[PDB]
Design an enzyme around this catalytic site. Structure first.
Site, PDB file in Angstrom:
ATOM      1  N   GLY A  96       0.811  -1.207   0.000  1.00 55.59           N
ATOM      2  CA  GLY A  96       0.000   0.000   0.000  1.00 55.59           C
ATOM      3  C   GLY A  96       0.845   1.258   0.000  1.00 55.59           C
ATOM      4  CD  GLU A  99      23.414  -1.920 -27.324  1.00 55.02           C
ATOM      5  OE1 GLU A  99      23.706  -3.134 -27.340  1.00 55.02           O
ATOM      6  OE2 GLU A  99      24.184  -1.031 -27.743  1.00 55.02           O
TER       7      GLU A  99
END
Ligand SMILES: Nc1nc2c(ncn2[C@@H]2O[C@H](COP(=O)(O)OP(=O)(O)OP(=O)(O)O)[C@@H](O)[C@H]2O)c(=O)[nH]1
Ligand SMILES: Nc1nc2c(ncn2[C@@H]2O[C@H](COP(=O)(O)OP(=O)(O)OP(=O)(O)O)[C@@H](O)[C@H]2O)c(=O)[nH]1
Ligand SMILES: Nc1nc2c(ncn2[C@@H]2O[C@H](COP(=O)(O)OP(=O)(O)O)[C@@H](O)[C@H]2O)c(=O)[nH]1
Ligand SMILES: [Mg+2]
Ligand SMILES: [Mg+2]
Lengths: 206, 202, 51, 439, 430, 432
Positions: free
Chosen positions: D144, D254
């Site tokens: 939470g 990449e």
């Protein structure tokens, strides 16, 4: 507690076992797959520290027993125990050791020039020409200064020399910035304008 | 194959040295080089240090690799790397200047391997040479009149190598450094002959 | 009004003979030193404690 | 001139971030104090430590991190322990009240007043750098405080900075083992916001390690001590190629350009090897030839998913050390011939190969045996849909009785917000099916 | 930082803290003189959780003491840890509640209930951040319940953003100490439900059962019952006051234990607890938890816990444990009684870990799960109200202090619906 | 051969003015007694006596004996010229009228001569530094009256004033609105450059960076103290680029009316945390314009930017200046006004900041001081008027002022100026 004693400094340099090492030559183990009661696995609910490592703690008689913990033996946060520096692969900061030395030395020097025993120049014996003030009529017009008593100055010298490469240790060990702990009466006594990091020295020293 | 026990046991050790390159030109005579020697698998490394404003493109000069002395035709072992000696690599020639305080502890740790490191064998090395002089105390007496012409009580390294070599005794540089480094009271490279003499005689 | 541990004697249960003014006694982390005794009290020492 | 910074948020976010440094710190010779040894007075070499840190003119180093949390317990204790001296004293912002597992508390109630400090910190943290490749944030989704602050932070990262690639390693609750009582709710709402802002997300469900710890490490009483660490090696592997010599380097930018077939679908699962007890690791050579074959073993998937239940779109696997590149062509080849694993129709080749020479260092007192040859994989497989299906249903019943809703409405959140989430999921299950159908 | 204060109405609440403030004293290592004599760093890090500081260096709790008569506080104050309390906070009534809910809720407190309000208010204001309150009272007592509730009423009007906890004691069917119990056992429930956030119901009767059936001692006394209950407090905040893998604050349980706004009553029982001699034979282990946490005899609730479908629960373990045995067992703890667990709330057992273990034991646990089984108490108590009220027995007392039957009539009306709406969920199916 | 005369009026200047000299002295090398310890440029604040000690270039005034005398007995009793600490006896008790109309008239003469005497030593008199806090009855006026005569006593001399204005909400006195309204009226048309030093903005500096939970007016001094050492640094040692007092009034005040500018100082990091960072140029100068560091309680973002001149000290290299400034311009949150296309005046100094004993400030190799003059300043002015607007409406606290010589119409005249000054700000900020 297996790790910090085993692969002992006699094991790595010009020794047999490496950092991980097949650490069964030194002590008695049981090569994983095995059934039985090693007498120390099921009872004490030792956590992590894969089964192989658990064994060495089992027979070597290190242990810690009893339903009632001997105060200290329970009063550790497991955070500390797990992440304890690097220890045994191959063999703290001197910070705040100079801080104390950097601390009193400022205190002593300021205490080494009070002009003890009527050593002040001829001027300053009376107040400045423009003074206002009381200047009581029936009083010794000059000023009287006691000052430190020889040994008092010399007393500070011994502590200053003793701290530098001496038996005296670092005062406590203190937190960084934002710890919201009680800090031993930072409020119970005002101690208002004291450069928060310095407070710890003012806090734990008492 | 590739040494399996060699990698696992002696992996951690890493020695660091500072050196200077010798070549044909003035071009790169004054720039410095730092040499890293991984004893785990006998791989040599070249690293470059560039001072601020110096204008040279700092970075890596040689990648870690493995290459050998053409003359003796035997791969590198820990023996050859010593203070003051010159190691031949590729088409360059490097010289070792100073050792890493981590190294020396590793350097002095293992006698019978780096003999010049063993303190005890160093003085005697000089001691066994004193046979030529007839009177042992004569060898004691002359020394004070050779190494220190002014008998000042303190000497510097640059003269000591010439002063000692002046007599003719042959000491490989790796022995010379060990002796002086022991008698430096304040750690500023200042010999104390008396301390040396006291050990030599009293 | 309940049993209190005695620090002075190995954490033992107290006894009537302990009370001796002029010598201090401690009870449950407190400092007690009596001043005098009720003249009724003096008799009781004067009839049984004697040996 | 290349680096990547770390993002930490949420209880698990702080806890996991704990392990990464010791594995990272020990690698470069940085002890807890900061001055490497008291002995090594040479330095000024092997310029790679900038990959994760920065220099301070003289002395110690500072980890490029900012620590945030809404509770004082965990953050405060980190200010008296073994690593008290490393993190920047003023960079570990702390809150005042906990989120109490109420998502609405962390997204509209309490997280609003603390996100500013971090966002302020991030500005400089990027400022001091020069070659920022991309951001990495670790956040336990089922928190939470971790989620509501977790979800928001990703929101501002899209606009204020933008195109920089952001990566997030969330840990959803286990398929059957659970800790909280309302974890499903903080699952999806946490799922929605990050859907259109995070380019990369990988599965790290806790339970998987649970079997991972027992099957190989042989731990009959494993605690949270050993769960995080094995993941830590996961973090190290992905960024290992950017700070050491490599034959064919792979960049973080990449990474997300070769594992996300569409801008929409941006989830994949991973798994690591080898994990074997140090007391018995060496008797087998996780063998160099068979290391890769260990990659696709379903039992070693760090996520409770069955890759065998779907086709494989592409594999992103990285080795480490001195494995001969020739073996990479061969060992990987055998997989294609295998019939137990089948690919999607339109993808001929989905293997990205990265080879690095540096070997993974061994922790003190850890589980993994200091090994010679290892390899790890990061994959995006349609089977990923398997987890969501089970996750979806758990909410269906919950909203049917609108239990626990009343507090959420008390935080000011719009009831209609939940409405969009299930609409969001409709495509999630829907879009995969369309991709899963061969041409 | 997330601290709470204490207030206790009447004799009942004052005694509860007696063994309570002692307990909070020993865990952190504070003597009866308040001086610090600890060994490790932990025992002082969060000492503000129940103590404020003043000049001179002696640490004290922040407890609000109030009662309507002088007999009680003239007894506790002299006991162990009795000097710790702030004598300034001491104020009390002079006539006594007289075991009547009517007298103590409209005549006496109204003139003086401002007094606690000031004492209640001030202690809350000076702190840096305020977290919640924990109030202990009795439903079978005059001043306790009566003055107890209204103080809860006013506070809610001023601090709507915090949590409120009240440990209430309702009279078990066997051991009833007041004939007029049903009324104050009746009127109180209405007011508490409409404002309370978290409620824990404990019956003295089940306390007796635990003592004999677990401790197997000869003659239990009120001190020991304080020994059993006081520890149960240590379950809630022991995680909240020291490190932990997954700290579980009050609101963490609240969001994880209160499925609906109008169901805020729980039943709990503590473990471990074994007879003194048998302490050696038992081998404490995580397995030893599950069998005793959910076991009937550990349930301090007068109602049988196995006579309904469990909705949700939380676990706050104590001692060095790897959660693996904490987690895996619970899932086993649900399936083996899947017929004992409601079906539309998956994964309704919560767990937590606290590094520091309770004193004298290497492992301990406090269990809290929302269960319909309590429905026996309200139904059993409810039946008692109309039997006496229909006859209007003892009605002059309540009718003699300005009250009517409309409030009493209202009190009975909402009770059935609350349970009636409470029992509906028992038969709910997906 | 550069000189400047320091004029201190009121306690607020007394405490800070006392503070400022410690900063300078330790930066010079003169021990507290003032005798060179057997050790030119240091003349900038001193005049040689021929042999021996040195006389600071300052004069102290006040209507209260308590504050001034404290200096005349402590450590620095031998510091100043013994007689120059002229002192009165009757304090205005924050009654502005009392400070300029019944008592201050006579005692002003002593001040005029003393400065008249001090300058004669100076040969190239550059200007005056005036210290005085806004929230003072006598403090508001006495500086003003000296301002009126001096402007007509020393001609075109360029001068500066480090005024300290009252906080938006936090205030110690109760009649602060009046004197502030007149004080600006008094100081609106007589000064060259005056800085914004409202205290409340100062406290905010302490907590966030110095991590101090309870600094008094003391800690305000050294942090404020560094500001004085900042501006005048370029005049009293070497530098690769000088910036003089004369070259301020012609670089920050485009119009004769708008002359209120708010400055800032940095870095400010204690000695127990700074060692973690290199203290780079790029990271520091961005701290200068940061909204959390402006020393005047106003928003440096609410309005346009006209022209900001920054002075650096340390071993900074100029290129760290050229690159950084380009970075600042391109930002889309700090924007310049339309009519000043370039507004950076860059200063560089070589000597490092003088670490205060013994003080709180850490040791750093670079420090920055920025003088900001932004259109948002109007927030301080308007808020002052509204307070003055509501208060004056009821003829409250008025009779105490007329009887001391004030004509009722005096208060009405000022209220025109502030809005009149208010009117100017909107006009200047409107783009063409
Ligand atoms: N991998 C891993 N997961 C953890 C660990 N600790 C807790 N978790 C998971 O995190 C979930 C809860 O989220 P947390 O981050 O711990 O809690 P939080 O984010 O602080 O939210 P609050 O507890 O309400 O403040 C639990 O259900 C666990 O499954 C851990 O040490 N490692
Ligand atoms: N920064 C700072 N401001 C101060 C200090 N002391 C007083 N002030 C300011 O001065 C105001 C009080 O009035 P002063 O101007 O000091 O009064 P004065 O200088 O003694 O002159 P009189 O009021 O006539 O006595 C307060 O509102 C403060 O804002 C100080 O030590 N540091
Ligand atoms: N926990 C606990 N409860 C007690 C003890 N003694 C009595 N009680 C309960 O307290 C109730 C009486 O409360 P009472 O004093 O009349 O409340 P008051 O009228 O509001 O002051 C009885 O019903 C008992 O059940 C005890 O030693 N411990
Ligand atoms: Mg949390
Ligand atoms: Mg004043």
């Amino acid at each position: 507690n297996t790790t910090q004693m085993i692969p002992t400094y006699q094991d790595v340099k010009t020794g047999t076992t490496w950092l991980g090492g097949p650490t069964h030559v030194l002590q008695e183990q049981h090569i994983p797959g095995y059934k039985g009661h090693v007498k120390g696995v099921q009872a004490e609910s030792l956590h992590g520290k894969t089964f192989a490592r658990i064994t060495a703690e089992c027979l070597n008689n290190r242990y810690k027993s009893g339903f009632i913990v001997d105060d200290e033996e329970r009063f550790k946060t497991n955070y500390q125990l797990e992440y304890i520096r690097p220890n045994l692969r191959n063999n703290n900061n001197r910070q705040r050791d100079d801080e104390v030395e950097r601390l009193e030395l400022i205190k002593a020097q300021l205490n080494s020039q009070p002009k003890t025993i009527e050593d002040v120049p001829p001027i300053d014996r009376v107040p400045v020409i423009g003074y206002q003030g009381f200047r009581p009529v029936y009083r010794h017009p000059l000023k009287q200064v006691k000052g430190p008593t020889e040994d008092e100055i010399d007393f500070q010298a011994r502590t200053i020399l003793e701290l530098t490469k001496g038996q005296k240790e670092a005062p406590k060990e203190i937190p960084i910035v934002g710890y919201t702990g009680f800090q031993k009466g930072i409020k119970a006594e005002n101690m208002f304008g004291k450069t928060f990091k310095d407070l710890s020295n003012a806090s734990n020293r008492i | 194959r590739k040494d399996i026990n060699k990698m696992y046991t002696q992996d951690q050790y890493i020695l660091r040295f500072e050196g200077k390159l010798i070549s044909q030109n003035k071009e790169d005579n004054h720039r410095k080089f730092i040499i890293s020697f991984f004893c785990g698998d006998d791989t040599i490394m070249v690293y470059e240090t560039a001072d601020k404003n110096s204008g040279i493109w700092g970075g890596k000069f040689l990648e870690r690799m493995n290459h050998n002395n053409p003359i003796n035709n035997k791969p590198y072992t820990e023996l050859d790397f010593q203070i003051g000696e010159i190691i031949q690599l590729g088409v360059y020639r490097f010289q070792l200047l100073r050792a890493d305080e981590y190294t020396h502890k590793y350097m002095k740790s293992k006698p019978e391997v780096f003999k010049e490191a063993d303190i005890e064998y160093t003085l005697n090395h000089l001691r066994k040479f004193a046979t030529k002089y007839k009177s042992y105390d004569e060898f004691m007496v002359l020394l004070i009149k050779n190494i220190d012409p002014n008998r000042r009580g303190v000497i510097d390294f640059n003269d000591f190598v010439v002063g000692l070599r002046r007599l003719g005794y042959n000491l490989t540089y790796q022995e010379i450094y060990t002796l002086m480094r022991y008698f430096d009271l304040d750690e500023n490279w200042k010999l104390d002959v008396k301390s040396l003499f006291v050990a030599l005689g009293g | 009004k309940n049993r209190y541990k005695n620090v002075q004697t190995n954490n033992e249960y107290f006894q009537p003979t302990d009370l001796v003014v002029g010598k201090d006694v401690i009870i449950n982390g407190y400092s007690f030193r009596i001043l005098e005794c009720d003249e009724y009290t003096l008799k009781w020492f004067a009839n049984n404690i004697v040996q | 001139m290349r680096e990547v910074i770390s993002i930490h948020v949420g209880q698990g976010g702080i806890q996991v971030g704990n392990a990464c440094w010791e594995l990272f710190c020990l690698e470069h010779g940085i002890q807890p104090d900061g001055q490497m040894p008291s002995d090594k007075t040479i330095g000024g070499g092997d310029d790679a430590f900038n990959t994760f840190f920065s220099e301070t003119g003289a002395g110690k180093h500072v980890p490029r991190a900012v620590f945030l949390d809404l509770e004082p317990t965990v953050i405060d204790e980190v200010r008296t322990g073994t690593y008290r001296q490393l993190f920047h004293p003023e960079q570990l912002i702390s809150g005042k009240e906990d989120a109490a597992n109420n998502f609405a508390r962390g997204h509209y109630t309490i997280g609003k007043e603390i996100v500013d400090l971090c966002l302020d910190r991030i500005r400089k943290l990027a400022d001091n750098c020069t070659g920022l490749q991309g951001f990495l944030v670790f956040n336990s989704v089922g928190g939470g405080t971790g989620s509501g602050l977790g979800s928001l932070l990703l929101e501002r990262l899209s606009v204020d900075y933008g195109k920089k690639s952001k990566l997030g390693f969330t840990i959803y609750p286990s398929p059957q083992v659970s800790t909280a009582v309302v974890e499903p709710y903080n699952s999806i709402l946490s799922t929605h916001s990050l859907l259109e802002h995070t380019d990369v997300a990988v599965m790290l469900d806790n339970e998987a390690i649970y079997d991972i710890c027992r099957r190989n490490l042989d731990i009959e009483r494993p605690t949270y001590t050993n769960l995080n660490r094995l993941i830590a090696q996961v973090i190290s592997s992905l960024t290992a190629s950017l700070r050491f010599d490599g034959a064919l380097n792979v960049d973080i930018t990449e990474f997300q350009t070769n594992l996300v077939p569409y801008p929409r679908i941006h989830f994949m699962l991973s798994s690591y090897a080898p994990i074997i007890s140090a007391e018995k690791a060496y008797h087998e050579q996780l063998s160099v030839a068979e290391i890769t074959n260990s990659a696709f073993e379903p039992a070693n998937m760090m996520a409770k998913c069955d890759p065998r239940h779907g086709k494989y779109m592409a594999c992103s696997m990285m080795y480490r050390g001195d494995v001969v590149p020739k073996d990479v062509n061969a060992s990987i080849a055998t997989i294609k011939t295998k019939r137990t694993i089948q690919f999607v129709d339109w993808c001929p080749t989905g293997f990205k190969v990265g080879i690095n020479y540096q070997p993974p260092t061994v922790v003190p007192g850890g589980d993994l045996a200091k090994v010679m040859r290892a390899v790890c994989m990061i994959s995006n497989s349609t089977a990923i849909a398997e987890v969501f299906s089970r996750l979806d249903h758990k909410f269906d019943l919950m909203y049917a009785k609108r239990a626990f809703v009343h507090w959420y409405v008390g935080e000011g959140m719009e009831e209609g917000e939940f409405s969009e989430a299930r609409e969001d999921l409709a495509a999630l299950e829907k879009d995969y099916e369309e991709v899963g159908i061969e041409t | 930082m997330r601290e709470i204060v204490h207030i206790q109405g009447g004799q009942c609440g004052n005694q509860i803290g007696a063994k309570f403030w002692e307990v909070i004293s020993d865990e952190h290592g504070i003597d009866p003189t308040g001086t610090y004599h600890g060994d490790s760093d932990l025992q002082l890090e969060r000492i503000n959780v129940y103590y404020n500081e003043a000049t001179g260096g002696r640490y004290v709790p922040r407890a609000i003491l109030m009662d309507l008569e002088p007999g009680t506080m003239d007894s506790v104050r002299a006991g162990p840890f009795g000097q710790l309390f702030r004598p300034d906070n001491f104020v009390f009534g002079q006539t006594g509640a007289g075991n009547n809910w009517a007298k103590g809720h409209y005549t006496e407190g109204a003139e003086l209930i401002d007094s606690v309000l000031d004492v209640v208010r001030k202690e809350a204001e000076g702190c840096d951040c305020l977290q919640g309150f924990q109030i202990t009272h009795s439903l079978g007592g005059g001043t306790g319940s009566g003055m107890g509730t209204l103080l809860i009423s006013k506070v809610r009007e001023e601090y709507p953003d915090r949590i409120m906890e009240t440990f209430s004691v309702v009279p078990s069917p066997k051991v009833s100490d007041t004939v007029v119990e049903p009324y104050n056992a009746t009127l109180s429930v209405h007011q508490l439900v409409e404002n309370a956030d978290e409620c824990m119901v404990i019956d003295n009767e089940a306390l007796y059962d635990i003592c004999f059936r677990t401790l197997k001692l000869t003659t239990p006394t009120y001190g020991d019952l304080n020994h059993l209950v006081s520890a149960a407090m240590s379950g809630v905040t022991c995680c909240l006051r020291f490190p932990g893998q997954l700290n579980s604050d009050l609101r963490k349980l609240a969001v994880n234990l209160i499925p609906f706004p109008r169901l805020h009553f729980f039943m709990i029982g503590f473990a471990p607890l074994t007879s003194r001699g048998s302490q050696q034979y038992r081998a404490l282990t995580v397995p030893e938890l599950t069998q005793q946490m959910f076991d009937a005899k550990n349930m301090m609730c007068a109602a049988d816990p196995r006579h309904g479908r469990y909705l949700t629960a939380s676990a706050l373990f104590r001692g060095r444990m790897s959660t693996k045995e904490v987690d895996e067992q619970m899932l086993n703890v649900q399936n083996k009684n899947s017929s004992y667990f409601v079906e539309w709330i998956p994964n309704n057992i919560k767990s937590s870990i606290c590094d520091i273990p309770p004193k004298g034991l290497k492992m301990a646990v406090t269990f809290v799960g929302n269960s319909t089984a309590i429905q026996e108490m309200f139904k059993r108590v409810a039946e008692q109200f109309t039997a006496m009220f229909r006859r209007k027995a003892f009605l002059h007392w309540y009718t003699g202090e300005g009250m009517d039957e409309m409030e009493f009539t209202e009190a009975e009306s909402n009770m059935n619906d609350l349970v009636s709406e409470y029992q509906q969920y028992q038969d709910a199916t997906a």
